[PDB]
Amino acid sequence: TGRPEWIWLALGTALMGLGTLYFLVKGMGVSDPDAKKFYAITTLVPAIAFTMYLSMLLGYGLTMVPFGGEQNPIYWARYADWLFTTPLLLLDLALLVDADQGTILALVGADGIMIGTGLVGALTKVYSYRFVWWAISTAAMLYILYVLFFGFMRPEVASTFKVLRNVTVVLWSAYPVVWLIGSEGAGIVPLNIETLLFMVLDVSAKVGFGLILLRSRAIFGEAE
């Protein structure tokens, strides 16, 4: 199309699609029940992202929100993606460490709150209030990060969890910043650059994260 961000949406669609196919093929033949869980979660994540990238590319997942006296292009489909994919990603971490159910519920619920309030902020027509939602969403993210560090095994489990926790902190923490400087927030970075940034983050957080996880012996039960 003639939205300059189309190229990043197209590459995102492609990389999510290819990552989905790769993980699908890779998990073919896996019989270990524990490993199956990780393959399922980890393949579902970019498959969902693929659909939502495509919806943005085709224009379905874009709406105009009036605020600051303009009609502002907001890609709402990102939140529909994140609503499902972010708890899934947290579930991969939580299963790695054999987290308590209470802890999993805390994580999933805080994540739901993070995404839902981010969506509310994204669609809010009173400019100043958009940042209230951003702050609440960010608080939920900080709670999530706190639990990953202070709320929790085989040495390979510890090692893989540590690496993935670090990837998670670094990549996830960038999202509120991009939103804040981008078209959803202060509008200091144009939508095409914002789209590029989220594409790099998303591909790393999904396909990159998944490559790290699915390469590890941590996803298998200890078997002779």
Next chain:
Amino acid sequence: TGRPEWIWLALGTALMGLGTLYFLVKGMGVSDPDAKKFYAITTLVPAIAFTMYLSMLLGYGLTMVPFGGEQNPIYWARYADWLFTTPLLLLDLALLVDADQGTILALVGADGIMIGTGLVGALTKVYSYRFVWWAISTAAMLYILYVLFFGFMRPEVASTFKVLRNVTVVLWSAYPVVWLIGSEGAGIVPLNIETLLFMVLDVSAKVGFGLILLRSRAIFGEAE
């Protein structure tokens, strides 16, 4: 009303309602925990369908989508039904065979993708792109069917699973065809006939499927 498809919506509402009441009464008194799971899942399915049929009958679950240069009546409430009822139905099959959690997640997630992309296709304003969504949704359905045949007990469990798997393949595979030839897709069959077809499919896939399942000794633990 004066929408000619009202009669099929009314009969669908009635048959789902009656099926719900029948399963409710039938599962009264069931104490076996395994059987309770099947009664719960299986009664919930037509209860949800009853609500969404009624919403279509009353006109709430209908919207107009512009495409191909017309205002096209799209019953969106079907997807709200299917979003919940189709994974529930898959859950009945998966519990019958004591499926791995990874496999259940794969099934539920692929199903979510099937329904969500079908909804996107149903609401998409660019005619040609509607069929892209249809294709992606169909791929998700084919993945689901593949898992039911290649991804998986007491002989009565095997026997009941086999029958229900066959019912599932035959009925579910008809949905993409009806959508394709109907008002959502190529518009070769009118909405009133499309509605009739989905009504027959839905009642069979829910109340018919449920009668088969709930009549079986497979839903009970092996007890003396």
Next chain:
Amino acid sequence: TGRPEWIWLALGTALMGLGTLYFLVKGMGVSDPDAKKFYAITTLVPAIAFTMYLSMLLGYGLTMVPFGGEQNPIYWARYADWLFTTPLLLLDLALLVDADQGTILALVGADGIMIGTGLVGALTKVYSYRFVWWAISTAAMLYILYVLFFGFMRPEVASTFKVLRNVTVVLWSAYPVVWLIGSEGAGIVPLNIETLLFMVLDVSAKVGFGLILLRSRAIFGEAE
């Protein structure tokens, strides 16, 4: 704002926010896995309510629905809250009594139906039909109440469950009445009083319920 109900929305936001913070601090340090489940569920409930109260206060969670020949202010965000918080509350009760999974699914599903049909009724443009949805929603509520009394331990578990079941029946049963007499239904009580009533009910059903639950020894495994 100049909506007279703003004061009740503001106090609701505050009390849910404070209740969230209190439960969060209170559950700090809890290591018992069973207790963690209850703290997680019970803190998530007012955290979600806090977000949805704030959304109503800020005006995001309000829409106008034409019916009875007027444009009627309907707070839809209540349903988005209840959709998540009501099954969570039922989950607290069900975990207390170690409910069968079938029973939990029945409860959660009936609750989903209660809330979804209440939302449909709230948004329905044909006045008389709003009450059809109300009736169906009420039937789902009555099913839920029936299960809590007829569908189900350590003496402290029994004692706490009994108290919380009674609180639940009394408070939950008031909701259909308020809706019926309020702006969503017959319009005999003005929106500002309706808002006050739901605020008192919600705070009691969430923060009050939670204080009772989290003060009990019932939420802990039996340990030496």
